[PDB]
Amino acid sequence: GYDRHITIFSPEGRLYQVEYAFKATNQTNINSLAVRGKDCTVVISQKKVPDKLLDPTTVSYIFCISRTIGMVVNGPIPDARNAALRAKAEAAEFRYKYGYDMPCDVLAKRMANLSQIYTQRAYMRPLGVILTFVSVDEELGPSIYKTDPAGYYVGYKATATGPKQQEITTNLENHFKKSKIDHINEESWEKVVEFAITHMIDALGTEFSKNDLEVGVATKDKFFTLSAENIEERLVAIAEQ
Amino acid sequence: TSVGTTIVGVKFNNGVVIAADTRSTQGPIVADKNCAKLHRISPKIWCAGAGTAADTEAVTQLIGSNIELHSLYTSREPRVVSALQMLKQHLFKYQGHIGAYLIVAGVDPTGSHLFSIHAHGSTDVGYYLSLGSGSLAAMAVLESHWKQDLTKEEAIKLASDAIQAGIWNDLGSGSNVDVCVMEIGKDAEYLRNYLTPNVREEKQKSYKFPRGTTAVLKESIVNICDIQEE
């Protein structure tokens, strides 16, 4: 039964090491969510600092890949940082070779191809991570593209990842069934963040303080993460209506 | 490199135009009287080349090939800045030994663009440019008549007038004017032999020989067909 140890086909045509890499994805017990506005793309992720000896400012699963592209990761931090360092290198090389900023969907494809290689080559293991790339692309506009250990990737109107992804996914599905549009019809990113947090609260059935969340926002020509005080301002607005 | 050629590029209202003469030379001898110097990198990115003719053709095809694969990979229409970056980094690596001097022009989702590139890998930006042995004659016309906010018709006129200056005044240039117009939101229109001001006059005499004039030793049929059945 060595077909379960390396990335070769089982008699059923399955790759067990890929399937087990998907399971490692949920080891952190963290859920993330991404949505698109008119002018922006917002990604939120749960933040859990279980040890009091930790410096909470260094605990993060959101990465600034380039000026325009942001990436949230679902999976263990070592593999997350492995993927983060590579994505940063790939995005910088692209700009140097081709003279324009690497698009979000193209970076996703590139990282998906790298992942595909790990599912075909035996000496390389898959990374136990799911990567959600976000930006406001200069051609396609607000963009969400997500990659997994199988080397699969696709664009999203909105998406969710983690142990309780299904609850969040269905909640988001129900909203877009009502509105009948592919995005959050809102001018400011602040309100799109408020929408994202509100619908995660509804889906998970939990309340959040300023230290329980992590937020990334993509606008035209920049991606940035919110501070605890920026998130606090967001939580206050949610509670006041 | 090869001394010869007049090529220009001119920006206008809603796009860019490039033009070239049609003479290729080997020393003082005219090899081809109707050469095509306007090369396609991609449907809406065109370039014109001076210097070593094989190098301008080869470097255009290579980058054009890689641009096509890049376009397919990214699901995006190719950009002029990508062609420029790939051309310059290739040329720089070869230290001038690839004798390609190009004017690169085109339209893409970002807008309309006009660049020049020199064999050692340096590039420049401009509203009007000229390259080749007839570049000084062409630039004289461009510096005399260029203005901001040219129309399509004015830019075609200026470009071809600049090529004509090269045709008449530069010995390295001659014959016809080729033009390619790249307008935003439109197909690029390649105008081969846009002007033809150098048709040879009828000869005084016909030099058709009487049949049997040439002395022949042997005749034989050449078998161009494959080995036959039966």
Place this chain on the structure above:
Amino acid sequence: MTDRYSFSLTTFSPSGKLGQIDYALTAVKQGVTSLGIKATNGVVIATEKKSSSPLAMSETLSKVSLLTPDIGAVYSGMGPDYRVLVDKSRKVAHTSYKRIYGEYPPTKLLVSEVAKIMQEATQSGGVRPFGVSLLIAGHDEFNGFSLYQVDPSGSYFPWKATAIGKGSVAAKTFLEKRWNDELELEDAIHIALLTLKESVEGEFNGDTIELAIIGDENPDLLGYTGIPTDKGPRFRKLTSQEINDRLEAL
């Protein structure tokens, strides 16, 4: 580090079977149905856009891919394997042909190059076979229209019409009854849509079906005018609206 797997991972079993190839074909069997039909004046290739989630934008996932202006490809099996094969197929059409002969390869020879890549993943050190079967449709001046199937082993066969994946056995029987050597391209598209409906459970429309053709030259898709000999690509992906129009005459 270093790749220390320099030995074959696919080997002959006592019965003469190449296990990893058989298992790759099993993965293809589980895949979504795709098909191809050849007409007198064109070829059609089609498949279902099985969207993994309704929040996913399935237009961003292309199952039918342009390889050259006159050649297209569709698959059944593992999507990620297909995607990298399309990247390699596009590049090899340039490196081993267009940069040599100044023209795009004929369908049969590009198929031959893709087949070789798939064969090598069946014998080279430290790799598994590709878990896909490809259907490649194309046109070239001297061979006309053609349709080929390529399997995980690297074997390829030319077809008048065929299907691969989930409901291929039933679909091939359906195609045998309908196919003749006098079909026009519109007739082949009609038969393709009829055949594909049988293997599709849920929604059946232009947004859930991906369909492309190899037909007449499209000068409107060339992007430039002025060269008479350049008349445009023969590969054309049908729009969501174009598919729905033909679903009313179904």
Place this chain on the structure above:
Amino acid sequence: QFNPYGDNGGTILGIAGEDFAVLAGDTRNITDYSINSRYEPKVFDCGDNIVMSANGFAADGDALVKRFKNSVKWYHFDHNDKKLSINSAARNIQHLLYGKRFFPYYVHTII
């Protein structure tokens, strides 16, 4: 253009007696018309009762003596502290010098 060689002057003299040998050399080191040092030792005790001097370009001279001294050290390591005889040292120095046949040590060596 870069010239990898130089001339540090100096003169050396070796004489073999019946049961003794002397190796002498002046202590002056020069370039062109300048004195670098009035006392820069040029003849060296290399162990095993062997003395050596490599006169000419002093950088090559110092490099050769250094490598030979090192060769004496490793001869002891590899061959059970056997004394390196003068004839064996001479053959060894030939190989040190011929190793740079196409980029020579610009020196005249005497042991």
Place this chain on the structure above:
Amino acid sequence: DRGVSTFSPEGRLFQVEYSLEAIKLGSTAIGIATKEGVVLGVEKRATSPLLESDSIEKIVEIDRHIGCAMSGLTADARSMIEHARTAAVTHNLYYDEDINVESLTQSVCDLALRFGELMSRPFGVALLIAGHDADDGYQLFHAEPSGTFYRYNAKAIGSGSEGAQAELLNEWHSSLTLKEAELLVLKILKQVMEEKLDENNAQLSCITKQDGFKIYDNEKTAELIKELKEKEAAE
């Protein structure tokens, strides 16, 4: 399976220990060192009477002052001999002198542990290296596939080794002549050999300061065998 360079729980390399078993199956080779020279003798052990026994080469010259006998998988010894000859000649080229017997032996033993996943396995042959140099006189060394070499006054290797070594324990003393050593090798070879010892199935050799390494003629050895028979019948 398991690594080729794996240690056993006792702290021994499996492959080295197994190669020692292959050497136990080899034909007997004996060496005796004296102040008049070192004698080397071997059992040829032809597998059939049609095999021309003088083509069996289990005693070999490395240099004029160094000889060598082998036991075990004798095909493995060829590259070891090639290395030994090259090392001996190379040192003479570099230093205008003879190489020490110990230094030669050490050079050969450096090859031994160069195996892994370099060669794929250890050598399956043991060597008796005998010679003379000015510093340490007449010497006999036993080179193993472990990379270890011991100096010996007398040593036997191969299938009859422990019986022969017990015999060498009793017979060797520091005043042995070259002639006495020759007969002693013949006597002990005759004791441990399956077939009856003669000049065609056994071979003698020696190394002296004056004449260097010499493989004995079959006629010369035949006389020493006859001399042995008579002196054993003498009591």
Place this chain on the structure above:
Amino acid sequence: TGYDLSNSVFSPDGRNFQVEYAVKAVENGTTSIGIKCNDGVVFAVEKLITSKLLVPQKNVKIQVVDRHIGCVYSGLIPDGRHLVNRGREEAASFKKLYKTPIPIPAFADRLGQYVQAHTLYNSVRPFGVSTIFGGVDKNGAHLYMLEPSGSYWGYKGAATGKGRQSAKAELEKLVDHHPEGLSAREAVKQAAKIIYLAHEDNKEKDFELEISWCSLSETNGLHKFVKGDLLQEAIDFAQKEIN
């Protein structure tokens, strides 16, 4: 089963058992700690005196990287030395290209990516050490701890080895009782106490205390070993607290 016989193999749980077994080697090692203070960091380690024949103060465990970073580790000591050697190469190349000494977060990732790389293949073994390291850069003091998996975070206080539970509890008290912060000299005293308290898990043999520190005011942002009078003062403070 068999998933634990080879590095980089995912178990059906999604776990890398070989990395988890490396943690067991870390847990078997001596206690080492790190304390982040007001303008720097303090490192301390328990050194078991196996015999009287060990020369006191000679077998130094804490290591410097560049001139501003200190590193201490528990588990297989040779593995820790290998990691520091790499860290020194990383710091050298960073300073070569960018001139400025490597920032502590930058350095943390260099070690992290290298340790993570040893969980990607079956041809290598994971590191049998957890490393506590840090120092002072342009943005102030930083303390990190890095595990065999390649996982690392920033810390206020850190502990690893056999007496880590004891040490952690002591560190948690300091964090609660000093929200404003701890001075460098206080942190040295507290580090001595914590190692002495953590030595109860290793009570069979006696030990030797080793402390180092980087502080903006006390050491000019350079890594230095605590020696002589300052070390004795910390030992006395520690001995007073256990009695």
Place this chain on the structure above:
Amino acid sequence: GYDRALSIFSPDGHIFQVEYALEAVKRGTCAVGVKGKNCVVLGCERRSTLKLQDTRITPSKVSKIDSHVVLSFSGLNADSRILIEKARVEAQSHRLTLEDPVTVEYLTRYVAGVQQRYTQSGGVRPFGVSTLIAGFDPRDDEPKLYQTEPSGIYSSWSAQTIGRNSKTVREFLEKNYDRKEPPATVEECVKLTVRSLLEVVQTGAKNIEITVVKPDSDIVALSSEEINQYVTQIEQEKQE
């Protein structure tokens, strides 16, 4: 590159891959070598399980390495081609550098060295081939016959056989070959070689190949009829 140690020692001191290579030799068709006073004869078995064979073009069992040396074998046919090619290249290299053709012993020593190398190199298996190498040294009239095997050991033989049922034909040769008086003529040597194969072969038809090598590069292969005459004469003397 593929570096796996395939040939390794077992607890009892055996290298099984080398020993299993000998089992491939045991399966191969029988080959025999007999040296006379002024010649060497190489006899080879052809299994008659394959008819409809084209004997003009089918690889012959005896191969010339040079104009004066020949090589026959028992075992894997494909493996033997690699050894034959290497030997032929070395034979020309020797002539080029030493300005003298190889001795039979030298050529044997080279082939045996290649075989040994393949028993302690990573990523390779031993040759499933044993060889008989025969000929005459340049300007020498003394017959030479050597044998090699997968392990890489080699030796000289007055007469030898390898391959399937070689135990039987060696039995014959050991009682029929006298060292004090070897086959004095070509006839006597060929006769003794054909006799030795007839102990094992089956039909004396196209199953026996005979090649005679004499001094000064005089090598010739006997035809079906010539061999058939030996086969006829042997059994007519046997009917008594």
Place this chain on the structure above:
Amino acid sequence: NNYDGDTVTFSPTGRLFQVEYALEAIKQGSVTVGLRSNTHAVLVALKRNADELSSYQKKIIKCDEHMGLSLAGLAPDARVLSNYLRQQCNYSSLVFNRKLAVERAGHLLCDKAQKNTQSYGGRPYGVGLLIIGYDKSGAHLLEFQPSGNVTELYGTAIGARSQGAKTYLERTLDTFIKIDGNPDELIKAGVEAISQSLRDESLTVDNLSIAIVGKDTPFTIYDGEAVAKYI
């Protein structure tokens, strides 16, 4: 058990069995003792013969004029590691005109041994080493294990029955450290130490091997009648 097939595999309790098996080879090796004062450092080694016809295997190797070691375990591995030390001592002198510090020599040996414990295909070294030396900080004694662990000590012993000598040195610690400027008395203490590890056999003239290095004493090895004075 299932985790001792190679050096690249941890056991479920975090052990490296191939390294532990390499450590076992040292325990089978012959006893050797190391001890030092403030002026000198001494190695004493019990050499082992194959039989009565054979020589006694040499145990002590000189690395430089100021440094050397004694071995216990696989002798060829000691030759590899001592060759590496010779080179490193040599590099330091040639490039920096500097005698290699004994502590730095220990660090280099640790790192060399470590690489063989973390990679596939290789094996750990199967030998233990006792390094003595005199440098700019006085006399030194190191103990090397092929696990990579190197330790600076006043005195120690490795090999079979080394525990007896190690206990003796632990008792005598306060006496032998004070033997300054008296080489003969320091060697006596080492010969008395190694005697606590002997059974059935005693120290003879071709059995005993002694090495010493100190303030004005180059690393020198004594064998044969040169050690009869200490028997």
Place this chain on the structure above:
Amino acid sequence: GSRRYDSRTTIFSPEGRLYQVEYALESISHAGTAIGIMASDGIVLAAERKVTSTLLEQDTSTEKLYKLNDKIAVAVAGLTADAEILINTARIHAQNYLKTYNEDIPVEILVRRLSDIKQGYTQHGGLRPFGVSFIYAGYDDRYGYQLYTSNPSGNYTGWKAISVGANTSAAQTLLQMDYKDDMKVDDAIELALKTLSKTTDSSALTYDRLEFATIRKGANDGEVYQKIFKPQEIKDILVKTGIT
């Protein structure tokens, strides 16, 4: 490490057999039968396509018979993809020889080259062997018309008539029965088709299940012509020989 997953494709069994070669030969025994017959005035190659479909485009299809050059052709039995790798290498070797010597490569030299490539995969590299057996039909001016076969071991032999693939035991007996040395191409064509018709696992032998080729000096005067038969031409020869 990686050793754990190594099948060791290049090792002897205790009986001295190459496992992977033997198992590759087992694979080939299930492939469609290919037959080669050599006559005085030419060579015939006949081969059975494996259970086909009515929707297979036969006139553009090739799985059995391949051209190596104008004088040499091969019939394939086994993995088609493996065969094409070797076929392209053989095509290159033939051209290399033609460039070097300015003469067409002799048949055996080409056959030996391909067989040596197969041999290499059985002795070194740790890769699986090619699961292919070839029948080589060719002509050169030294030996004239020649038939060879090679198999995954890299062993090759010459033949007057030979079969590879499925039912070779039955096919070889039938060929051995009816083959004669003075036979002509037209007779050999009939023998090949009759042999396939009897050994086939299909219910009947039809044109759509066959590939057929002849190498004839039936090319106008002293030269050789290769003829890869078209589907209609296979249908005609089946009627002519009285099989359909």
